[PDB]
Design a binder for this molecule. Structure first.
Ligand code: HEM
Ligand code: HEM
Ligand SMILES: C1CNCN2CNCCNCN(CN1)CNCCNC2
Ligand SMILES: [Cl-]
Ligand SMILES: [Co+2]
Lengths: 447, 454
């Protein structure tokens, strides 16, 4: 009835608890101590962190709660604008872009992207085939090279050529620095930060706008999201996306997809390395199914156990670990916690995924077999892709890409944990295993 | 590309007379021992291929290539189970509709609601055995069937068959068992329109009418009463398919009720019986199981949470399903032309039958000790290769009742071990009777009460 609350720091209330490298991990520990719900206060604001499937299923009721922009999303909005991920549900451009882009992201639409995903996957596999005996792989670094290049090519027929470099494409440099500035503002001479922030925004916009105008003037048609956006009309308003919003969407697809998908691949590879029984089943499937020198769309869909490995990695370490909601009207949560219109909730996805009343007593174990029967998972128990109409539009893209790439990696190599790597989870706006490195031993299967 | 072996033929009847035996599944297991992982089986008008290796069965379980087929047995059972979940094709509207409506009634969560009524019947079983005199013994499969039928009747439609109050079953049960028997016997009939069978046909129709009359009455009583229980019937009357917002019609509801009794009672009863048989043959396993039951079941009746902690008991049950899966076969058809195992080309529509007891004896999976009863094999699901263990079928057409069956069997086996030591007073020799399911015929024991009150 009265909600618990963690330790306070006088006038700063709970705010200094987030003054740390690893705030989500700090909140998970607080949730272990305090339970399914706790209040978090800061000067001028309040939120309530939810961890149980019991309360989170109510929060996922779209008639009672809508998406809120966290402070991080509000800062990212300075360069992602009113793109899909940083727009409010009630802004005209949210519904417009949603209606226009949903058909570009369906399971069916992945057939058109497949060839370009394969282009980048092959580049990754060739890079690793070409290492010398003495060398190792930096896993999150190479996964990020891959996911960025894949979203560039499928998104706007643009090659970042990340496997040709040590210093990224200037675009990527600016984007990563902008994200970093957005994140750093969350807990704050800064005139130089501000000048840099503006320059990085100008870099991102100049590139993207040029491409859009080149494509518009050329009239050429590709198998990309940019083409669908230029041809697309919203049935409701009858309008296409304006050129500016198109550019916010392109920036959005890079920011929203690349880092989360890269983290997923990295965690999956980490967990496979720690669970040889799971690795054996995954690798067997990859060998049996991927019988051609490059994978087909239909073959990726047959990688069922690989998909289960990916879902279990998202269970333990959902790479976009939180989403925020507000109460549409006065309402009572769980029969116990009255909320007023406008009150904020935050869903702690890693804690949801550790609800023992749902998953049983072995919640920290890596066991893909939990996902063997998709029907056995209760509704709202597993939410790595958010909720409802504001769920991840890129879900099918992310999973097709990760399934393809993890399948090819297992097909072509055995991986060795040559450093006895200790998991260290770095937090940006997403989660990834920092410093994860492996050595590969080629199975010598040609492409 | 190889040519598959085929067992001996009988002219016009092809391989059909091989199934004209008391124990057809056991006969097929012996054929599989002789011929290997795959063999063709022909009968007038039909062909199937029996699979026995995990190597081939993992491909057969690919839902993109193969879908559920109704075996000839399922086709005959469909005369009384209609388009209930077990006898419907995946592409019939009522399959997906009933599946969507009923899945929430069968979840691990939903078992909390059934627990009390499962306990009601389990207590009756325990009291029966506490009340035997010194001279007497237990008929195990008979008492397990009394239990499983009564449990599904009470949890399924708030109806008491009162099987522990009788020698001759409820008329419903008599008809159902006789219908199943007729369905089974038609499978081996070389001359099904011989006049000899006109009485079989008349009897079959009467038994169908008995089943339908009872069930339809209950449905209409409940509909007119408006009363709400903790049962499957209530969920079916209230339930709306999320896609369409439509409920099941009254007739399909009656097929589903007939289906739950047929599909759950016999298999679960067999599982309990085999588990008890194996515990009696493996004293070291019995000791661990009984130790767990005594340590976990600390109250006079078990709670839901306690049953979930009976982990070794659950492993015992999985190992019993390994050696003697009580629904021993399922059938598939090829969705399109495809090649099985890199060696056997199949055409669209071609049939496969998975011989589950033989899958479960694949030495390349389980090792050289495959005939030994070792529950410890199930300690880590990740160590088991894909599709090696299929007692509940496959994919979207897997057993909807799996959690129900295992909760019930875990509860009841836990209580039996808590309350009694069992004696193999006859040195019983395993004899496996075949209906459409498997059970140990004539298994009897004597119980010695531990005198622990309920
Ligand atoms: C494993 C990979 C991914 C994860 C875990 C993930 C997770 C999420 C989550 C949790 C949200 C909801 C955020 C909120 O409520 O505030 C979301 C939204 C979104 N994601 Fe992803 N995502 C992934 C990959 C991708 C990819 C590859 C793309 C694009 C190609 C993408 C584009 C988006 C967009 C546009 C939204 C906003 C949708 C809307 O509100 O209309 N994501 N994602
Ligand atoms: C140890 C006990 C049990 C075993 C071994 C077992 C086994 C199976 C198998 C192998 C199938 C698939 C059949 C096929 O592919 O043709 C199946 C389906 C089914 N079982 Fe069970 N079962 C058991 C208990 C139960 C119980 C207790 C219920 C109901 C309360 C039940 C209801 C069903 C239903 C309705 C289907 C059809 C599901 C569908 O296709 O949508 N079973 N069972
Ligand atoms: C026609 C040939 N009948 C010869 N006999 C043996 N056939 C066994 C299978 N019978 C099924 N059909 C079809 N068989 C017709 N039954 C006729 C009686 N069987 C005699
Ligand atoms: Cl005939
Ligand atoms: Co004949």
């Amino acid at each position: 009835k009265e909600m618990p609350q963690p330790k306070t720091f006088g006038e700063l209330k709970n705010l200094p608890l987030l003054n740390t490298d690893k705030p989500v991990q700090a909140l998970m520990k607080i949730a272990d101590e305090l339970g399914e719900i706790f209040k978090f206060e800061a000067p001028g604001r309040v939120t309530r962190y939810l961890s149980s499937q019991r309360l989170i299923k109510e929060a996922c009721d779209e008639s009672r709660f809508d998406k809120n922009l966290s402070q991080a999303l509000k800062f990212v909005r300075d360069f992602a604008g009113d793109g899909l991920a940083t727009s409010w549900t009630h802004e005209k451009n949210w519904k417009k872009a949603h209606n226009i882009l949903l058909p570009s992201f369906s399971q069916q639409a992945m057939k058109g992207y497949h060839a370009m995903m394969v282009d980048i996957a092959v580049q990754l596999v060739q890079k690793w085939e070409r290492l010398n005996a003495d060398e190792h792989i930096e896993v999150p670094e190479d996964m990020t090279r891959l996911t960025l290049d894949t979203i560039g090519l499928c998104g706007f027929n643009y090659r970042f050529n990340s496997f040709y470099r040590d210093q990224p494409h200037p675009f990527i440099t600016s984007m990563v620095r902008a994200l970093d500035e957005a994140m750093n503002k969350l807990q704050r001479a800064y005139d130089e930060n501000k000048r840099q922030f503006q320059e990085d925004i100008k870099v991102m916009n100049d590139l993207v706008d040029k491409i859009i105008a080149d494509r518009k003037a050329s009239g050429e048609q590709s198998d990309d999201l940019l083409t669908h956006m230029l041809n697309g009309k919203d049935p409701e308003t009858g309008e296409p996306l304006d050129d500016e919003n198109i550019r916010y969407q392109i920036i959005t697809f890079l920011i929203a997809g690349h880092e989360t998908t890269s983290g997923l691949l990295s965690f999956a590879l980490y967990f496979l390395g720690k669970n040889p029984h799971v690795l054996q089943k995954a690798a067997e499937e990859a060998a049996r199914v991927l019988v051609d020198p490059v994978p087909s769309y239909k073959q990726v869909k047959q990688l069922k156990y690989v998909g289960m490995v990916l879902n279990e990695a998202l269970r333990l370490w959902p790479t976009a670990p939180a989403f925020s909601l507000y109460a549409k009207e006065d309402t009572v949560l769980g029969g116990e916690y009255p909320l007023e219109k406008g009150d904020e909730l935050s869903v702690l996805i890693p804690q949801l995924h550790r609800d023992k009343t749902i998953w049983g007593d072995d919640v920290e174990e890596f066991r893909p077999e939990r996902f063997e029967n998709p029907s056995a998972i209760p509704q709202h128990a597993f939410k790595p892709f958010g909720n409802g109409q504001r769920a991840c539009i890129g879900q099918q893209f992310a999973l097709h890409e990760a399934t393809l790439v993890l399948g090819m990696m297992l097909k072509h190599f055995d991986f060795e944990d040559h450093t006895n790597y200790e998991l260290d989870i770095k937090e940006t706006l997403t989660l990834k295993p920092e410093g994860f490195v492996v050595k590969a031993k080629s199975k010598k299967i040609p492409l």
